[PDB]
Amino acid sequence: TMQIKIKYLDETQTRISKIEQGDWIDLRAAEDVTIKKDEFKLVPLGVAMELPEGYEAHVVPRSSTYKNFGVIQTNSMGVIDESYKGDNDFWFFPAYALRDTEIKKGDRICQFRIMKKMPAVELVEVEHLGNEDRGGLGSTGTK
Amino acid sequence: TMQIKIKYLDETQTRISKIEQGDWIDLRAAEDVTIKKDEFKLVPLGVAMELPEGYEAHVVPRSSTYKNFGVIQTNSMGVIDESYKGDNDFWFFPAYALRDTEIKKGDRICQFRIMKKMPAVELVEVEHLG
Amino acid sequence: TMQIKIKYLDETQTRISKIEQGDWIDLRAAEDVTIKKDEFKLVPLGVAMELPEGYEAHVVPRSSTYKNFGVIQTNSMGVIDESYKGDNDFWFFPAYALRDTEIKKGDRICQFRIMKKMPAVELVEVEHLGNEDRGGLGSTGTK
Numbered sequence: 001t002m003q004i005k006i007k008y009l010d011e012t013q014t015r016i017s018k019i020e021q022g023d024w025i026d027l028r029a030a031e032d033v034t035i036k037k038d039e040f041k042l043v044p045l046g047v048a049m050e051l052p053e054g055y056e057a058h059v060v061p062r063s064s065t066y067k068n069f070g071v072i073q074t075n076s077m078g079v080i081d082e083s084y085k086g087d088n089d090f091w092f093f094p095a096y097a098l099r100d101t102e103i104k105k106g107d108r109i110c111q112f113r114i115m116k117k118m119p120a121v122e123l124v125e126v127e128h129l130g131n132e133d134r135g136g137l138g139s140t141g142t143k
Numbered sequence: 144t145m146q147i148k149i150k151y152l153d154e155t156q157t158r159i160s161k162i163e164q165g166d167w168i169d170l171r172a173a174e175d176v177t178i179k180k181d182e183f184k185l186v187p188l189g190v191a192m193e194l195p196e197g198y199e200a201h202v203v204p205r206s207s208t209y210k211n212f213g214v215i216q217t218n219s220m221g222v223i224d225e226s227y228k229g230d231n232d233f234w235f236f237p238a239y240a241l242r243d244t245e246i247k248k249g250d251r252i253c254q255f256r257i258m259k260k261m262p263a264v265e266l267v268e269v270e271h272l273g
Numbered sequence: 274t275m276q277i278k279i280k281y282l283d284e285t286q287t288r289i290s291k292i293e294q295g296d297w298i299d300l301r302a303a304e305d306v307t308i309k310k311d312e313f314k315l316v317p318l319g320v321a322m323e324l325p326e327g328y329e330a331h332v333v334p335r336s337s338t339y340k341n342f343g344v345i346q347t348n349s350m351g352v353i354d355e356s357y358k359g360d361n362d363f364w365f366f367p368a369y370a371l372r373d374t375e376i377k378k379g380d381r382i383c384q385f386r387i388m389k390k391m392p393a394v395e396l397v398e399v400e401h402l403g404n405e406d407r408g409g410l411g412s413t414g415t416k
């Protein structure tokens with residue numbers, strides 16, 4: 001219905017696809033990558049996209065990314081704004097390895113979806129809010 | 144009002160609840176779990192659910208999970224696909240421990256909400272962007 | 274535009290305000306913070322807010338946070354509950370350092386957006402779901 005235009009780094013990239021039981025779409029390593037334990041690598045995903053106007057993309061690991069590849073995503077969740085749409089605006093997955101690992105070209109290491117950007121807001125400075133505190137950081141306990 | 148249908152692993156699971164000042168709902172460890180420093184374990188949450196038609200769920204840690212339990216969630220924000228609604232599709236929290244830790248049965252360790260899924264989209268391959 | 278009321282901790286906090294059309298908004302460390310390798314610290318952000326009615330906020334690292342500071346966010350994506358709007362409900366970024374690091378007062382370290390909260394839902398216990406199993410945790414493989 002809405003269109004995402006996708007440009008691949010080259011012909012050798014494995015084209016991404018929606019699967020029926022996957023609500024997000026898996027993204028793939030653009031090359032083989034070796035990462036040592038406790039080291040970092042920006043893993044190319046080999047895709048550039050023009051998202052629909054007013055949308056952004058979010059990128060997170062798969063549940064199995066750690067078991068299969070030994071990495072976490074250092075930025076937690078990546079945000080790809082609609083403006084990141086140029087011919088050379090390729091996506092990357094920021095990986096920290098918790099064990100020595102090999103990722104192979106084409107491996108499905110993360111997943112993405114789109115959703116609307118937040119509404120327009122205006123931040124208005126006040127000197128006092130006049131509300132009771134909720135508390136946070138575990139105020140409700142654990143049991 | 145939308146319904147979430149929840150099936151518990153067994154009668155010993157602590158039934159989950161909404162609290163007024165919690166915009167996401169807390170989920171609980173299904174059993175005692177020990178995790179050693181620099182090890183991974185899938186913490187069972189003791190729940191299987193059928194979400195409203197067209198919805199997914201998202202799962203993240205509580206802010207106090209790291210102090211209390213010394214774990215991070217390896218997938219950052221877990222996505223529960225709408226199709227994960229079978230009788231054996233029990234939810235889990237994928238934990239990596241940064242120190243030796245013990246989690247007790249019933250402990251509130253993460254939180255979830257529901258969200259409309261991304262609609263069907265067309266992926267149109269192009270040679271160049273604009 | 275929807276209004277967000279923002280209160281700063283003190284006059285020394287670096288103000289955000291600017292024109293806001295949908296992009297995530299950067300937040301800043303409220304004081305200098307030193308973190309040792311493999312240790313944790315709250316990083317105070319020096320802001321308290323009242324979000325629009327019916328909205329929560331989400332906080333993630335900036336894309337450059339790991340490169341600049343060597344930290345990951347321990348809760349991945351922070352959820353600021355709508356009720357966290359008191360005069361002493363100051364936001365924080367929960368940081369774990371993978372190297373020795375220094376964060377300076379005023380340094381941009383994380384980013385946020387608002388989002389409509391999940392509506393009221395009824396939790397209905399059932400004995401049996403009656404659907405086929407999907408499976409999970411990497412059931413679709415990696416290739």
Ligand SMILES: O=c1ccn([C@H]2C[C@H](O)[C@@H](CO)O2)c(=O)[nH]1
Nearest residue numbers: 078079080084090091092093336
């Ligand atoms: O995980 C991420 C997040 C962002 N980006 C893109 C979009 C953003 O504008 C740019 C700089 O962070 O890189 C990625 O490739 N991966």
Ligand SMILES: O=c1ccn([C@H]2C[C@H](O)[C@@H](CO)O2)c(=O)[nH]1
Nearest residue numbers: 063221223224227234235409410
């Ligand atoms: O943190 C997570 C992520 C996923 N899953 C289940 C549901 C999802 O549909 C399936 C595959 O990701 O695994 C969980 O229980 N926990």
Ligand SMILES: O=c1ccn([C@H]2C[C@H](O)[C@@H](CO)O2)c(=O)[nH]1
Nearest residue numbers: 136137206351353354357364365
């Ligand atoms: O990263 C986080 C997560 C939570 N909180 C506050 C707001 C939230 O309502 C409360 C409980 O999680 O703690 C933060 O300031 N930062």
Ligand SMILES: [Cl-]
Nearest residue numbers: 201256258331
């Ligand atoms: Cl979310």
Ligand SMILES: [Cl-]
Nearest residue numbers: 058331386388
């Ligand atoms: Cl979000």
Ligand SMILES: [Mg+2]
Nearest residue numbers: 022062111413
């Ligand atoms: Mg999947």
Ligand SMILES: [Mg+2]
Nearest residue numbers: 140165205254
């Ligand atoms: Mg909470």
